[PDB]
Design a protein around this ligand. Sequence first.
Ligand SMILES: *[C@@H]1O[C@H](CO)[C@@H](O[C@@H]2O[C@H](CO)[C@@H](O[C@@H]3O[C@H](CO[C@H]4O[C@H](CO[C@H]5O[C@H](CO)[C@@H](O)[C@H](O)[C@@H]5O[C@H]5O[C@H](CO)[C@@H](O)[C@H](O)[C@@H]5O)[C@@H](O)[C@H](O[C@H]5O[C@H](CO)[C@@H](O)[C@H](O)[C@@H]5O[C@H]5O[C@H](CO)[C@@H](O)[C@H](O)[C@@H]5O)[C@@H]4O)[C@@H](O)[C@H](O[C@H]4O[C@H](CO)[C@@H](O)[C@H](O)[C@@H]4O[C@H]4O[C@H](CO)[C@@H](O)[C@H](O)[C@@H]4O[C@H]4O[C@H](CO)[C@@H](O)[C@H](O)[C@@H]4O)[C@@H]3O)[C@H](O)[C@H]2NC(C)=O)[C@H](O)[C@H]1NC(C)=O
Ligand SMILES: *[C@@H]1O[C@H](CO)[C@@H](O[C@@H]2O[C@H](CO)[C@@H](O[C@@H]3O[C@H](CO)[C@@H](O)[C@H](O)[C@@H]3O)[C@H](O)[C@H]2NC(C)=O)[C@H](O)[C@H]1NC(C)=O
Ligand SMILES: *[C@@H]1O[C@H](CO)[C@@H](O[C@@H]2O[C@H](CO)[C@@H](O[C@@H]3O[C@H](CO)[C@@H](O)[C@H](O)[C@@H]3O)[C@H](O)[C@H]2NC(C)=O)[C@H](O)[C@H]1NC(C)=O
Ligand SMILES: *[C@@H]1O[C@H](CO)[C@@H](O[C@@H]2O[C@H](CO)[C@@H](O)[C@H](O)[C@H]2NC(C)=O)[C@H](O)[C@H]1NC(C)=O
Ligand SMILES: *[C@@H]1O[C@H](CO)[C@@H](O[C@@H]2O[C@H](CO)[C@@H](O)[C@H](O)[C@H]2NC(C)=O)[C@H](O)[C@H]1NC(C)=O
Ligand SMILES: *[C@@H]1O[C@H](CO)[C@@H](O[C@@H]2O[C@H](CO)[C@@H](O)[C@H](O)[C@H]2NC(C)=O)[C@H](O)[C@H]1NC(C)=O
Ligand SMILES: *[C@@H]1O[C@H](CO)[C@@H](O[C@@H]2O[C@H](CO)[C@@H](O)[C@H](O)[C@H]2NC(C)=O)[C@H](O)[C@H]1NC(C)=O
Ligand SMILES: *[C@@H]1O[C@H](CO)[C@@H](O[C@@H]2O[C@H](CO)[C@@H](O)[C@H](O)[C@H]2NC(C)=O)[C@H](O)[C@H]1NC(C)=O
Ligand SMILES: *[C@@H]1O[C@H](CO)[C@@H](O[C@@H]2O[C@H](CO)[C@@H](O)[C@H](O)[C@H]2NC(C)=O)[C@H](O)[C@H]1NC(C)=O
Ligand SMILES: *[C@@H]1O[C@H](CO)[C@@H](O[C@@H]2O[C@H](CO)[C@@H](O)[C@H](O)[C@H]2NC(C)=O)[C@H](O)[C@H]1NC(C)=O
Ligand SMILES: *[C@@H]1O[C@H](CO)[C@@H](O[C@@H]2O[C@H](CO)[C@@H](O)[C@H](O)[C@H]2NC(C)=O)[C@H](O)[C@H]1NC(C)=O
Ligand SMILES: *[C@@H]1O[C@H](CO)[C@@H](O[C@@H]2O[C@H](CO)[C@@H](O)[C@H](O)[C@H]2NC(C)=O)[C@H](O)[C@H]1NC(C)=O
Ligand SMILES: *[C@@H]1O[C@H](CO)[C@@H](O)[C@H](O)[C@H]1NC(C)=O
Ligand SMILES: *[C@@H]1O[C@H](CO)[C@@H](O)[C@H](O)[C@H]1NC(C)=O
Ligand SMILES: *[C@@H]1O[C@H](CO)[C@@H](O)[C@H](O)[C@H]1NC(C)=O
Ligand SMILES: *[C@@H]1O[C@H](CO)[C@@H](O)[C@H](O)[C@H]1NC(C)=O
Ligand SMILES: *[C@@H]1O[C@H](CO)[C@@H](O)[C@H](O)[C@H]1NC(C)=O
Ligand SMILES: *[C@@H]1O[C@H](CO)[C@@H](O)[C@H](O)[C@H]1NC(C)=O
Ligand SMILES: *[C@@H]1O[C@H](CO)[C@@H](O)[C@H](O)[C@H]1NC(C)=O
Ligand SMILES: *[C@@H]1O[C@H](CO)[C@@H](O)[C@H](O)[C@H]1NC(C)=O
Ligand SMILES: *[C@@H]1O[C@H](CO)[C@@H](O)[C@H](O)[C@H]1NC(C)=O
Lengths: 124, 99, 122, 442, 108, 129, 116, 132
Amino acid sequence: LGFLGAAGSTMGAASMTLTVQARNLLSKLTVWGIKQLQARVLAVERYLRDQQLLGIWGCSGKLICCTNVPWNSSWSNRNLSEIWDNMTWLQWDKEISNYTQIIYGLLEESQNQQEKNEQDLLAL
Amino acid sequence: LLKLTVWGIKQLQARVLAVERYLRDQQLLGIWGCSGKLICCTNVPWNSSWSNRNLSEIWDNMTWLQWDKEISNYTQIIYGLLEESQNQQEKNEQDLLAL
Amino acid sequence: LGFLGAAGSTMGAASMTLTVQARNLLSLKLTVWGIKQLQARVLAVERYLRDQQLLGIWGCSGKLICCTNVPWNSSWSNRNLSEIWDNMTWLQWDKEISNYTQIIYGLLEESQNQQEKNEQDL
Amino acid sequence: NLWVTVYYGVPVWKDAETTLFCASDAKHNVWATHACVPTDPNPQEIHLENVTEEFNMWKNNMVEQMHTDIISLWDQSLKPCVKLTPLCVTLQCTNVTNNITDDMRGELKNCSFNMTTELRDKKQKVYSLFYRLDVVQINNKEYRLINCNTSAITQACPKVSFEPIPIHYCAPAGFAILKCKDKKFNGTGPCPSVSTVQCTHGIKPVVSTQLLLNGSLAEEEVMIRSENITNNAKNILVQFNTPVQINCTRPNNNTRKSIRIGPGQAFYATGDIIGDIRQAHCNVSKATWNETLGKVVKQLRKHFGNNTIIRFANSSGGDLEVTTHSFNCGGEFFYCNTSGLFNSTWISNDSITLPCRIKQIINMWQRIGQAMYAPPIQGVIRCVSNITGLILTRDGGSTNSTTETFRPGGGDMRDNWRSELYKYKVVKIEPLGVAPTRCKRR
Amino acid sequence: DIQMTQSPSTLSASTGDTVRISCRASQSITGNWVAWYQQRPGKAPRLLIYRGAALLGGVPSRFRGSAAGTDFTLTIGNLQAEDFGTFYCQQYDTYPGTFGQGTKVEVK
Amino acid sequence: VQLQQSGPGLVKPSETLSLTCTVSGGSISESYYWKWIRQPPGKGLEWVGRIYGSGVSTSYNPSLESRVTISKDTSKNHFSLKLTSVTAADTAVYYCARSYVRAETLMFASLGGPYNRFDVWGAGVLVTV
Amino acid sequence: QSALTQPSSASASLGASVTLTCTLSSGYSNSAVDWHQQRPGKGPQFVMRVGTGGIVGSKGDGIPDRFSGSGSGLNRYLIIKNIQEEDESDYHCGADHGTGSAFVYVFGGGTKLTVL
Amino acid sequence: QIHLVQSGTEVKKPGSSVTVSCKAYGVNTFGLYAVNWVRQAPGQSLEYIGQIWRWKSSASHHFRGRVLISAVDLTGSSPPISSLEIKNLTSDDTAVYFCTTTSTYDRWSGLHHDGVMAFSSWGQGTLISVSA
Ligand SMILES: *[C@@H]1O[C@H](CO)[C@@H](O[C@@H]2O[C@H](CO)[C@@H](O[C@@H]3O[C@H](CO[C@H]4O[C@H](CO[C@H]5O[C@H](CO)[C@@H](O)[C@H](O)[C@@H]5O[C@H]5O[C@H](CO)[C@@H](O)[C@H](O)[C@@H]5O)[C@@H](O)[C@H](O[C@H]5O[C@H](CO)[C@@H](O)[C@H](O)[C@@H]5O[C@H]5O[C@H](CO)[C@@H](O)[C@H](O)[C@@H]5O)[C@@H]4O)[C@@H](O)[C@H](O[C@H]4O[C@H](CO)[C@@H](O)[C@H](O)[C@@H]4O[C@H]4O[C@H](CO)[C@@H](O)[C@H](O)[C@@H]4O[C@H]4O[C@H](CO)[C@@H](O)[C@H](O)[C@@H]4O)[C@@H]3O)[C@H](O)[C@H]2NC(C)=O)[C@H](O)[C@H]1NC(C)=O
Ligand SMILES: *[C@@H]1O[C@H](CO)[C@@H](O[C@@H]2O[C@H](CO)[C@@H](O[C@@H]3O[C@H](CO)[C@@H](O)[C@H](O)[C@@H]3O)[C@H](O)[C@H]2NC(C)=O)[C@H](O)[C@H]1NC(C)=O
Ligand SMILES: *[C@@H]1O[C@H](CO)[C@@H](O[C@@H]2O[C@H](CO)[C@@H](O[C@@H]3O[C@H](CO)[C@@H](O)[C@H](O)[C@@H]3O)[C@H](O)[C@H]2NC(C)=O)[C@H](O)[C@H]1NC(C)=O
Ligand SMILES: *[C@@H]1O[C@H](CO)[C@@H](O[C@@H]2O[C@H](CO)[C@@H](O)[C@H](O)[C@H]2NC(C)=O)[C@H](O)[C@H]1NC(C)=O
Ligand SMILES: *[C@@H]1O[C@H](CO)[C@@H](O[C@@H]2O[C@H](CO)[C@@H](O)[C@H](O)[C@H]2NC(C)=O)[C@H](O)[C@H]1NC(C)=O
Ligand SMILES: *[C@@H]1O[C@H](CO)[C@@H](O[C@@H]2O[C@H](CO)[C@@H](O)[C@H](O)[C@H]2NC(C)=O)[C@H](O)[C@H]1NC(C)=O
Ligand SMILES: *[C@@H]1O[C@H](CO)[C@@H](O[C@@H]2O[C@H](CO)[C@@H](O)[C@H](O)[C@H]2NC(C)=O)[C@H](O)[C@H]1NC(C)=O
Ligand SMILES: *[C@@H]1O[C@H](CO)[C@@H](O[C@@H]2O[C@H](CO)[C@@H](O)[C@H](O)[C@H]2NC(C)=O)[C@H](O)[C@H]1NC(C)=O
Ligand SMILES: *[C@@H]1O[C@H](CO)[C@@H](O[C@@H]2O[C@H](CO)[C@@H](O)[C@H](O)[C@H]2NC(C)=O)[C@H](O)[C@H]1NC(C)=O
Ligand SMILES: *[C@@H]1O[C@H](CO)[C@@H](O[C@@H]2O[C@H](CO)[C@@H](O)[C@H](O)[C@H]2NC(C)=O)[C@H](O)[C@H]1NC(C)=O
Ligand SMILES: *[C@@H]1O[C@H](CO)[C@@H](O[C@@H]2O[C@H](CO)[C@@H](O)[C@H](O)[C@H]2NC(C)=O)[C@H](O)[C@H]1NC(C)=O
Ligand SMILES: *[C@@H]1O[C@H](CO)[C@@H](O[C@@H]2O[C@H](CO)[C@@H](O)[C@H](O)[C@H]2NC(C)=O)[C@H](O)[C@H]1NC(C)=O
Ligand SMILES: *[C@@H]1O[C@H](CO)[C@@H](O)[C@H](O)[C@H]1NC(C)=O
Ligand SMILES: *[C@@H]1O[C@H](CO)[C@@H](O)[C@H](O)[C@H]1NC(C)=O
Ligand SMILES: *[C@@H]1O[C@H](CO)[C@@H](O)[C@H](O)[C@H]1NC(C)=O
Ligand SMILES: *[C@@H]1O[C@H](CO)[C@@H](O)[C@H](O)[C@H]1NC(C)=O
Ligand SMILES: *[C@@H]1O[C@H](CO)[C@@H](O)[C@H](O)[C@H]1NC(C)=O
Ligand SMILES: *[C@@H]1O[C@H](CO)[C@@H](O)[C@H](O)[C@H]1NC(C)=O
Ligand SMILES: *[C@@H]1O[C@H](CO)[C@@H](O)[C@H](O)[C@H]1NC(C)=O
Ligand SMILES: *[C@@H]1O[C@H](CO)[C@@H](O)[C@H](O)[C@H]1NC(C)=O
Ligand SMILES: *[C@@H]1O[C@H](CO)[C@@H](O)[C@H](O)[C@H]1NC(C)=O
């Protein structure tokens, strides 16, 4: 398909070409020099601010990485057929746009408890 | 502090290219499943159309420069096969983990 | 507790809130205030990538509490496991191991080394 | 059977171009010494064995960046201080009548001129002492400056010094410098002993013509290098194996006078001389110069034949920069007449003295549009130098006889830094590779 | 409490030789909390080397120290005529501090 | 490229030590490591000291710390070895050797990297105390 | 570390292959061991540098092709195929560890090859 | 440069009180510094008596309830002084007393470990002799 080629498909048909968009996110003091320098600085900062959030939850190098938190029924009461086959990615981010902060908060303490529970496993 | 008389535009840009050359190498190594490894192994097979040499001739007689010069026409297809195989292995692990 | 809220506690009570400090170490003309912001952004990139490069050569990339197979020598500290985590803090433990920090930093580099592919390659 | 295995950190390098920053050793200067990073006292040099690299000193990109960095370092210290715009006017100049010798009959001139004071509707008649090479008559007499019809006059700034500081051109991350260790290397061809480094050695940005100053020395023999030895339009660089000491001095005792011009500005000129007027001169050894010329004519017969007569001559003609050896020590610019050194004919305790002239108007880097006025230095200026090289050209005859004529030349500043960067090559390291193995993942 | 033992008790040397003084603690000091003091007869004591092998401002480079386990050694090379006094080794690891017993250095 | 040793005769106890090893055929300010090695008669070898030729980085044995001093003089290309507080049971043979960094390319199965390599050994002088 | 090597008793006949062994302390298992040959009455010289597998560099100046090197896990073998009248000396190991500021060099006990 | 002075040589009797003063030129406040009072017997080693640090005065386990250490900050017309009072002295207290200061400004200075510190600058020494 190409870059952003599966933007109109469903959520189940666009979860297979994730490596196309994941590789195009990094790449005298005249007027055209400071703009290029600020663009490179902004690109490096936008890459690092996503890599840090990927590294906190424990998904360093994985795109379909799995978590351990349960899905609450108050966020979305839809089944697996009305999400991966009917809705797209431009509507699913707007459907649960009011519940992303609590999910991002729950994804941190569970990873912290999993890392601190591993310390009591090799101490036997 | 930061003075850009003659040596301020040459010290900042060196750190900029250092950050870029580190981040591009880390991004190219992260998409293959070898984040933090050097002698990691893959799952793709070696085709006989790229190099028909044996295993006793490359590791004891050849050089890295001559090896880069020899298979330079079959470089991007190995990276494409690795990028396909990493996504296929991740999808297979997600299919095995769902049961 | 907040950012740097467990500075007065011991080592056993401050090692549980590392996720607070693990998310605050990263975040147009040529006037006198335009270059200072770029300098601060470049310094914030430099003070994060240098600290992240040390965890990559030790095999602890992406882990907050990571432990390896390096044996702790008895000449570095002659204390038990109860007079360190329950009595001493992080501001007093760093002063005692200042003369043995580079030895541990050099021993941690070869560990993730003596654990690499050998002939198994053939 | 066989599986692909990636490797990170393979010794594969290519040729590329990048930017090299400064690194010096830890009162202001012209070159920004305190603005560079400190130098690592333990440099890492990796002797890369079984690697034969082909070097070419006449296609290097380091000298083209070094010349630009040297030029850009010169036009930044003349900016934030006083510029002498209304200086060149109709001067009334006479000769001098003091306790003077015979050779200084027409050199020193006593000039007088009007100048605007701090008030715009007032004048002030002052006087100064100028040299012969700085005044031009308009056909007591009427004289004017030389650069009043060509360039813009700005004064050399009296807070900076002009001493050479050794700097190191380091490489950023992702690049390296290959250096050949051949002691008889002529800058072009293969080299089987290479070394990977990050920074270079101490290079002093010294400017001169017809006589290479302090610099660096060779190891075994006198080296001869040229881009094309057949064509007579390329300069020939000669690198000695032993240093020759030359003592330059100026016995004058000049005093500085501050004529306060414009509002809030000043103008430094020469006052009155206390003593006698003697010529500035450079003494060189006569015993070592003949031996260095013998080494030159011994190492020069390998490219012209074993039965060729080598006749040394002086400069032919031109401007003041090419015909005379120009340098700067102490604070003043000296132009010396080297017609007495290149006088010999080689077939198959005394000291030589060379008189020089002090110039105050200098057109650096052979440009048109920018000039400089050096301030007078108070005191006696005596310096010593090491001649560790030569720049010689030749002319084409009728190709029937067995004689040659070598003359000193120069003018181009690229040859002064090509004798030090003739072994360093910037390369870019690529650490990724693939190889077939018998290992499989998981 | 830590009881510091200094060795030797009484020595004698001349101008040119090196003097080595050892100090042995009771327990193990892993943090290298030790200091060396000198005292001329009649004057005030003077700190020379604190924290094992770190020198003070004004002390010449001819004095050196080393620490190994419970052994703290002080070496004086190129001995002059202004160093003949009494030396002490004092620990400050635990509370309170304890000094040595003294080492008289005489001229031969 | 060659090493010439010059050692004294008998050494009295409780005194100083002085040894030298002059190089010939190469500069002393080059990127080369000079090593001082000791060997008692009958037992095995024992490395004592190492000094970098292009820097100030020196390395000594941990069992003989605060006792070994290695200096260098670039006037006539010398490096000197001193060992105060001489024990009478330290009669041995001393050797000066060279070592340099090598990172040659041969496409091995493992990566490895740069290592140290000895090229020039010494004759060795006998010190009897 | 510490270069645990064989003692100085090794019997060999004229026309036999001798496999000298240098071992580690079963803690590192990946290092490079130098082989120094000290003649009785003469100064020692550098011969080979063995490691994981074959030789990592080149042989010394004046070394025949009969000397070979091999490596297996914790053992490093120096193999001599033919024995001449000058093939008896003291064979010492050697291992470098650390960085430029914490450099250490551990030697071995040294074996003594005999002839019959 | 910091210079320390003390009182003069005095004699005493068994049953009186001894007051020793210690003045220091160069110290701005006593909050960035710590004062230590030690003694030395003629013919013996040194002994640590007491200290004051972070405006907290303390002594060892051998001189508890016997001595008293006090201090004052920068008075605008006098150097900051420190006083040591010994009550009901015994006839084995004839010694030379020393007043030392130690800078406790830097946390990673290495000259102090949780109050237990070394002495950098020394005073003059007060000779105290008691007899019948
Ligand atoms: C900035 O800002 C800042 C702020 O922060 C500041 O600072 C400040 O400063 C100041 C200065 O001025 C200060 O003040 C000071 O203080 C000090 C402290 O002290 C401490 O100590 C003490 C002692 O203790 C002890 O004792 C007790 C009793 O017995 C006990 O209990 C305890 O425990 C202890 O004991 C210990 O030790 C011992 C030994 O010694 C042992 O043995 C035992 O066991 C133990 O261990 C104490 O006491 C104190 O306390 C007090 O205080 C507190 C607070 O702090 C309180 O709370 C308490 O209560 C108390 O009180 C009390 O007192 C007070 C007065 O003070 C009164 O009022 C009340 O009522 C009560 O009674 C402390 O802790 C002090 O010391 C000082 O004092 C001084 O001064 C005053 C005024 O002037 C007076 O009055 C006094 O008396 C004193 O004086 C003295 O000394 C001097 C000098 O030397 C002299 O000159 C004088 O004359 C006097 O002398 C006298 O006496 C002595 C004795 O003492 C004798 O010897 C003699 O002879 C005479 O008679 C002062 O006050 C402050 O503090 C500060 N602050 C803070 C916060 O810290 C600064 O300064 C600024 N800056 C600027 C520049 O300015
Ligand atoms: C021209 O070339 C000559 C010969 O290369 C230079 O003379 C040399 O100057 C250096 C200055 O550092 C002398 O080095 C000496 O090293 C000893 C080592 O202990 C030190 O104690 C001395 O104080 C000094 O630094 C070197 O011996 C000397 N070479 C000779 C006299 O043959 C000369 O400096 C060069 N430049 C000029 C302007 O003449
Ligand atoms: C080639 O190297 C020699 C090194 O011997 C240079 O000679 C030194 O040059 C500097 C500045 O050019 C002299 O410093 C000046 O000395 C005068 C007194 O003569 C003083 O009044 C100034 O304030 C300034 O400090 C220095 O004395 C002189 N000699 C030595 C032994 O360092 C020479 O300049 C170099 N050649 C070139 C072209 O730079
Ligand atoms: C240059 O000419 C000026 C005249 O304008 C000389 O200045 C005079 O010098 C004489 C003798 O030194 C004095 O008596 C006069 O008072 C000076 N006049 C003024 C206006 O200053 C000057 O000396 C000449 N310079 C030289 C080097 O001879
Ligand atoms: C400086 O200015 C003065 C005037 O202040 C000039 O003197 C005049 O010169 C002209 C021609 O030389 C005469 O015709 C006038 O009579 C002079 N005097 C006046 C009051 O105008 C003088 O020539 C100028 N130049 C110099 C070098 O002194
Ligand atoms: C600027 O003035 C100088 C000084 O006169 C000129 O240089 C000479 O000008 C004459 C013309 O009268 C020529 O014949 C000479 O060949 C010039 N050179 C020399 C070395 O004497 C210069 O030409 C003037 N600039 C311009 C652009 O005309
Ligand atoms: C260069 O050489 C000349 C002559 O060889 C030197 O001039 C001599 O200087 C001395 C001292 O002033 C006089 O006594 C002599 O009479 C001069 N000789 C002549 C022929 O005039 C000059 O000093 C030398 N310069 C240097 C820097 O060495
Ligand atoms: C250049 O100057 C140096 C001084 O720096 C001269 O060196 C001296 O030469 C005399 C000649 O008799 C010796 O006695 C001195 O010992 C030399 N050294 C010093 C430090 O004075 C040198 O000879 C001069 N060269 C010339 C050609 O004049
Ligand atoms: C090179 O040397 C020649 C001869 O020594 C110089 O030619 C003389 O120059 C002067 C002044 O220009 C004339 O007066 C003579 O008539 C010339 N003689 C001849 C035979 O031509 C020449 O000037 C020197 N060149 C330089 C650049 O100094
Ligand atoms: C450089 O020096 C030479 C000789 O030292 C000068 O040649 C002399 O030139 C004059 C004319 O100016 C003649 O009268 C002499 O006969 C020449 N000397 C000889 C030996 O022939 C030469 O002119 C000088 N160069 C300059 C530019 O002045
Ligand atoms: C170049 O060298 C020649 C040969 O030595 C010089 O010619 C001699 O110069 C001297 C000096 O006046 C005369 O006395 C001789 O008569 C000349 N001829 C001979 C055959 O010796 C010539 O002067 C030199 N030129 C320069 C510029 O130094
Ligand atoms: C332990 O570490 C401390 C601090 O790193 C060392 O103290 C420094 O020692 C050097 C060497 O003399 C001095 O130049 C510094 O002034 C000291 N203080 C600092 C850096 O604050 C101490 O020497 C080390 N101890 C040992 C035994 O190596
Ligand atoms: C767009 O929708 C049609 C039917 O609705 C479907 O056949 C087609 O595949 C979709 N396009 C993409 C790129 O998924
Ligand atoms: C689901 O949401 C409810 C209501 O906010 C909350 O009480 C409950 O803890 C949540 N459960 C999970 C599993 O997040
Ligand atoms: C190998 O190369 C052949 C010819 O190009 C191609 O048809 C085949 O698909 C390739 N197979 C692999 C494993 O790359
Ligand atoms: C500070 O100390 C008190 C003891 O008095 C303790 O209860 C408290 O938890 C400490 N503060 C922190 C942040 O640990
Ligand atoms: C360099 O390596 C080749 C093998 O690729 C070898 O034949 C050659 O002898 C080596 N060069 C030297 C000087 O040993
Ligand atoms: C003044 O000097 C010039 C230049 O040498 C000369 O031509 C003129 O004759 C001199 N005039 C007098 C009067 O000396
Ligand atoms: C130059 O003149 C000054 C007067 O300003 C004098 O002090 C100095 O000594 C003179 N120089 C010489 C070398 O005589
Ligand atoms: C230079 O040396 C040669 C011989 O090597 C001699 O013929 C000639 O005259 C010498 N020249 C001078 C100027 O001394
Ligand atoms: C020229 O002379 C040199 C002197 O060393 C000699 O080696 C060379 O062979 C000669 N060349 C010819 C063509 O005679």
